[PDB]
């Protein structure tokens, strides 16, 4: 009765006879044409383990479970994916209309919706006229812009994000309490707010004459040194800006940002514009350490600091403990010479392929300090998910934020849409987001 030898969880196989054999073997061959296979044993006494589905990895029991479990949820899913993938990997190369006209759509959304260098002009005026107010009640601090004014990762409407150096001598929340106090009283500004359970603690004001609002923080020294690289970046490589900006508003991430952020997701995904320009064949970014520093091994790399930016063209690096190097500082250049000729519209197909088929996020470190290609092991972090090094704090996953089910799965799927949508002449995007870009 193959009704038995169906649904029997272990089978004598020296009881079969030839006939059963013969049927269930041919049952088995079918079965193979939906990734189903006899598993082949390490110590075979007719014991535990049957059938193992290569599709989804799972291990089946009987004849009548695999053909259940064909038909399911599990298997037909990954069916699908990999139809999916299927066709993602096979898509024509894009004609040469179709990828100037991505090219001019990129540089248009930076042009038109981008910081401009009259809108960094508007928002350094802010923090002069800002530094007068403080100034004048509390003369040892010292005011500057930081995030996307300097960087222009962000749109012409997002936040001004100003940072107060304070000396020691002189307490962090009594210092924002004050600050608080005086720009109430200051009719510069209207909707003069605290925001101090903010991953980052902040005085939110916003300034009458330019509209903007902006974000107050005291001794944010690493978002200081984090948007100075950028910064300098962006001025070296045309591409940086607007493939971020690209990536932020057209691939849809911005639907993750809120305004208890910290700023940490748009972060996360400019260090990824920025290691897929590192990783890129050819490389239209450096990396920021390795062989031009004398003894450098890029096995503790972790022994390394980056520092300030000096000539707008270096970053500095330390390694104050015991190492190979032999120098204790010294500067890395943060340009090539000449990444030259590359559409907007080819870089954007690639970015958009490059994190949707080509590299193995769950397995890697996106780390953009040096070219070699870190797995987790490599950092002793753990797998699944995303992994960004920050490079300033090089114990931080700064990528942790994304990894919650929701956002992780949205991140995917927003790759995978995009690609799609973009590979193909539907593309002159018009981004019409109903929401306020911060
Ligand atoms: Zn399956
Ligand atoms: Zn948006």
Known sequence: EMDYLENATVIDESALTPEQRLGLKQAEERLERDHIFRLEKRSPEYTNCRYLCKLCLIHIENIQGAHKHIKEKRH????????????????????????????????????????????????????????????????????????????????????????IKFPPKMNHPDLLIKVLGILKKNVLYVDVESDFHAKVPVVVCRDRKSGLLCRVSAGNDMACLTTDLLTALGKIEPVFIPLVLAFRYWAKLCYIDSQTDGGIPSYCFALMVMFFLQQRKPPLLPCLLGSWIEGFDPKRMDDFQLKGIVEEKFVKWECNSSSATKEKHGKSPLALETPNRVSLGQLWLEL????????????????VRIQDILTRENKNWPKRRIAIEDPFSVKRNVARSLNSQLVYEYVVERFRAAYRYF???????????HHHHH
């Open 352 to 367: 958009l392929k490059f994190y949707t088929l080509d590299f193995a996020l769950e397995e890697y470190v996106i780390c």
């Open 76 to 163: 037909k899913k990954n069916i699908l994916e990999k139809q999916e993938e299927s066709e993602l990997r096979s898509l024509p190369p894009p004609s040469p209309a179709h990828l100037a006209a991505l090219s001019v759509a990129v540089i248009e959304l930076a042009k038109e919706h981008g910081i401009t260098d009259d809108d960094l002009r508007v928002r350094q005026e802010i923090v002069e006229e800002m530094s007068k107010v403080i100034t004048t009640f509390l003369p040892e601090c010292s005011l500057r812009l930081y995030g996307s004014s300097l960087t222009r990762f962000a749109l012409k409407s997002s936040d001004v994000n100003i940072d």
């Open 423 to 433: 590979a193909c002449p539907q593309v002159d995007f018009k981004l019409e987001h």
